[PDB]
Amino acid sequence: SELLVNTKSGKVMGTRVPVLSSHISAFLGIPFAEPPVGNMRFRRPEPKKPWSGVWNASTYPNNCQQYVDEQFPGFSGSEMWNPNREMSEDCLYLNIWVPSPRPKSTTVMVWIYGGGFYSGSSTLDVYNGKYLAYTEEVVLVSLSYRVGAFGFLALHGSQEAPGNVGLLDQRMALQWVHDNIQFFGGDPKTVTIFGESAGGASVGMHILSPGSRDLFRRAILQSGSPNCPWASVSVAEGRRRAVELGRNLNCNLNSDEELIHCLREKKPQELIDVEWNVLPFDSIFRFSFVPVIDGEFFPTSLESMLNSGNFKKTQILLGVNKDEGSFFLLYGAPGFSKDSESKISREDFMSGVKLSVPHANDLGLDAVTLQYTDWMDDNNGIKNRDGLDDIVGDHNVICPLMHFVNKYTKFGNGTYLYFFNHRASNLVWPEWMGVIHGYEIEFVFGLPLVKELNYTAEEEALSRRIMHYWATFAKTGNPNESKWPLFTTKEQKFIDLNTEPMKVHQRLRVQMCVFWNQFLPKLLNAT
Amino acid sequence: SELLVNTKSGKVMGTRVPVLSSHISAFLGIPFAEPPVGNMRFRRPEPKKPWSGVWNASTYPNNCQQYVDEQFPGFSGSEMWNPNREMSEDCLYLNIWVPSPRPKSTTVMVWIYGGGFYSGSSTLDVYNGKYLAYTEEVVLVSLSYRVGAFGFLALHGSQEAPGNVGLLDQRMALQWVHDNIQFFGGDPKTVTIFGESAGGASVGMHILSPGSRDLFRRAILQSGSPNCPWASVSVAEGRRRAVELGRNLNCNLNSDEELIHCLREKKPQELIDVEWNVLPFDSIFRFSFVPVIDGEFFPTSLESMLNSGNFKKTQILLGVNKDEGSFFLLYGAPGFSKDSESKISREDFMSGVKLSVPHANDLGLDAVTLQYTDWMDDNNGIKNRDGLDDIVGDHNVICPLMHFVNKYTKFGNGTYLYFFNHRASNLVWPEWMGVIHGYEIEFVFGLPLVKELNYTAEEEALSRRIMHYWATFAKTGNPNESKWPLFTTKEQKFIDLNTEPMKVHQRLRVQMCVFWNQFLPKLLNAT
Numbered sequence A, B: 001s002e003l004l005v006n007t008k009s010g011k012v013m014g015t016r017v018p019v020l021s022s023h024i025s026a027f028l029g030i031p032f033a034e035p036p037v038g039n040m041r042f043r044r045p046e047p048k049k050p051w052s053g054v055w056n057a058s059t060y061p062n063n064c065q066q067y068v069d070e071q072f073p074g075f076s077g078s079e080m081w082n083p084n085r086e087m088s089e090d091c092l093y094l095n096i097w098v099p100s101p102r103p104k105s106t107t108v109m110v111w112i113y114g115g116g117f118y119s120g121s122s123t124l125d126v127y128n129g130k131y132l133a134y135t136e137e138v139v140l141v142s143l144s145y146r147v148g149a150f151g152f153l154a155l156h157g158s159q160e161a162p163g164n165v166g167l168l169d170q171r172m173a174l175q176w177v178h179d180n181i182q183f184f185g186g187d188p189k190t191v192t193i194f195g196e197s198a199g200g201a202s203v204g205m206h207i208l209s210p211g212s213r214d215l216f217r218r219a220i221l222q223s224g225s226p227n228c229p230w231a232s233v234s235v236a237e238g239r240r241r242a243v244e245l246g247r248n249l250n251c252n253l254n255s256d257e258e259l260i261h262c263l264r265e266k267k268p269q270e271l272i273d274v275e276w277n278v279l280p281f282d283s284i285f286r287f288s289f290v291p292v293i294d295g296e297f298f299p300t301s302l303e304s305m306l307n308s309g310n311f312k313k314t315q316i317l318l319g320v321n322k323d324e325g326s327f328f329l330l331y332g333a334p335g336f337s338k339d340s341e342s343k344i345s346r347e348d349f350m351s352g353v354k355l356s357v358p359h360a361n362d363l364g365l366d367a368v369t370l371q372y373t374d375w376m377d378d379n380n381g382i383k384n385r386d387g388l389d390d391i392v393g394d395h396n397v398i399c400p401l402m403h404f405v406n407k408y409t410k411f412g413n414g415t416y417l418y419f420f421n422h423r424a425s426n427l428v429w430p431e432w433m434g435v436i437h438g439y440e441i442e443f444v445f446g447l448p449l450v451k452e453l454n455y456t457a458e459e460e461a462l463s464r465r466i467m468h469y470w471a472t473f474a475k476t477g478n479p480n481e482s483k484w485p486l487f488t489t490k491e492q493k494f495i496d497l498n499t500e501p502m503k504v505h506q507r508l509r510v511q512m513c514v515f516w517n518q519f520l521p522k523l524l525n526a527t
């Protein structure tokens, strides 16, 4: 039967799902690891023991234990990222959307969800693979991984909690796709991994980690990169935050063993409640438990690796959105409100700047401020608000990605860079937020195709267009079959991704990025 | 007789000089101090002993001993600043242009020539007061002072050479005008001192020095201010350069006395030849012997004085030219030539930046470079050349003046700010130089009125217009009788000075000046 598939792990029974006046097969909730529950918490993922009988894969699996956003209860604009399924420590599953009739050996795309490494669900509505799978005829897989302390508590030196296990979780799913995507009609030799933000940074972390490279062909990174200031910490800091988390729970901190045992006895929610009390600074765009530069998963510093070419050379298609910072200022910078134009004042701008560059000293803050302030109209609340948006996105997303892109393109075999700057006609967030972090996804996953969603004809068109780029690129290592120029260390060309006639530009945010990538770091270091 | 005047110093016989189809009286070469020759060299000016008989004041006096420019022999564009009279250590004279018939009690304007404190002549063609005096009916006086080591060798602690004597020379002339300008028909209660560059900085130094304030009513400063990076040095540095100068002449450096004696035995030219070998850095826009913050002439640091309001509060009219740096890059930065468009390359830009900010460290140089580089077209030779022009002018002229202006306006009784950005239709210097440092003078002195000079009708008009502003302001403390707005700490309005309809703008070069006046200094200090 088209809905029954036999894998090296056991028989899997999917379900026929309708799509744009048609149907396809979906296998949801396929286990790819042993439940990381019990004494396994914090530990590396064990391979999922094979099962006898048919595994029921017709319904979404539980979501991983994560901090739930309640900043705007009932607000679609925010609840849309919230777990839409019971949360559980038993969440290591994957979902596959396979065209009908079942392919033989077609392109495979593996989606890695974001969420700051502390949240995320593959089961999210915006992650419904059925539209991409059907329209582009690809076998779409969406994995899951442990987020928060559950997947990133890093007590280096210890085997009970080495950290990075959330990354290992992504890899084991990648390992499972390599081993079983064939029986689903997918070509395990043409698998593209892609993710947004935390997923995009994850994707790039797989490009760098020696133990992950062989498990995929090419990669797509959306608003995220491995070298993002928030995507990783040192083992020292990771150890620092792990102990501090134990402190928050009145744990025996006399030994890693003592510490881990305590944390393992705590209910999941117990850890999620104090999870935020461990950051070292008052900051925006920073999360407690993220990947650690352990020396294992990451042989050396990410910078040295990018420099020495120590990483998987292949084709990469990546980009950023126009207003990456907006989402983060709305949640933690004073002066920003969801229901107001959020015009910012000097005092609030200075407060934002401070929250945005936590590691910066005074001279550094002065540097940032001077760089984004129009001293001929410094009291402009819209300029102050916008400049603060740019500061957060440039420093946390746009510039770190421009570094990686320029570092990679030197040894890579093909780079394609886009700048998504289109605002959904039906966005529910305030307009001052603009093209919000994570709002290109719906187009990538072709949501603008479902009439019930109220998108404009142009948006459906842009979605289709973007969706073809992703797939076509996944399939051929090139987005093209109007030509989206290749990015070269020389010309640095990139294109705009919106409902308007393609346009090509060069040096995406050089000025601001030369400051973020070269000057500031040199300054902060000198001082 | 209209050409004979009796002063407290002796009888002075002038000469009737023709002007724009008319005539006026001129008394040139009136001594105002005892010749600073002999053991008097380096010493403070002594009052000129009164003379019996009539002093012949119908011809220009000698020029002070200064380094002569031979960078472009015979080139009018440069020789026009060169001494047009025998140089001599006996150069302390002043010239007065008095209208005919002789006034009774009319406005007095005293011109202080520039020349980096190492050169300058009141007898220069562009300093011919006859046009201003005649047209505006003012009694125009132009003094002289000792430049170079002769007027600025600073061996603090010693009375033989305390330094700043060149400033004292200007003051003694001011003292002589206060005491004798009446017998010439000038009102010693309405005397405005004005000068360009070194003279403009001098002017402001008289506004700050307690012992100079009472000797004049208001002041006009053109492309120069007291706080310019090159207008003064510390006594330590002044002592450093004095000894180094002795070293250059194989002098006994065992004691200030030993040192001064040696330097006094040397012929003037002996000192001018090695004068440049004493700068502490490889630099542009820096001169060996300049005013010292001695604690006498300047009670405290110029910054503290400007901050505490410790200075003469009155009306000031000041401004800058568009391309102040151009003249200095043409003479010392690699890549600049008088006969080429001087398109600069990255390597030469970086070399310019280095020469422009000598005291800057690496981080500082990186700061400057990032601030003036268009990283989307960084190889543009015209942008590189222009950006380097701005760096030199902004840092050495425009920004230091914007500091002073903003500091003064807080305690002053009237500030008028202009931005002269008109290029003489008959300029002989290359066009890449633009509105060159010191090229507003000819308009201020109404040269565009003399047909033989080939100026356009508009330029003669602009000259006349500017000349009325200066005089009208000198006379009333206001340039106006189309209204040139007053500059206020709040609005910071200033106007453009060119042949086009007056336009008012605000915050003259804020961006670049916030960097030069606040950020860079904070950085250089932090690092």
Ligand SMILES: COc1ccc2c3c1O[C@H]1C[C@@H](O)C=C[C@@]31CCN(C)C2
Pocket (backbone or CB within 6 Å): A069, A081, A113, A114, A115, A116, A119, A196, A197, A198, A199, A437, A438
């Ligand atoms: C660094 O990126 C993020 C940090 C935190 C969050 C998100 C992030 O990226 C956004 C889009 C997508 O990746 C998932 C969640 C995000 C939007 C919802 N908020 C509440 C959580």
Ligand SMILES: COc1ccc2c3c1O[C@H]1C[C@@H](O)C=C[C@@]31CCN(C)C2
Pocket (backbone or CB within 6 Å): B069, B081, B113, B114, B115, B116, B119, B196, B197, B198, B199, B437, B438
């Ligand atoms: C800091 O200003 C200067 C430093 C050196 C020189 C001049 C300066 O200002 C110029 C205009 C006027 O003030 C007199 C001389 C100048 C033009 C001729 N050169 C050769 C000497």
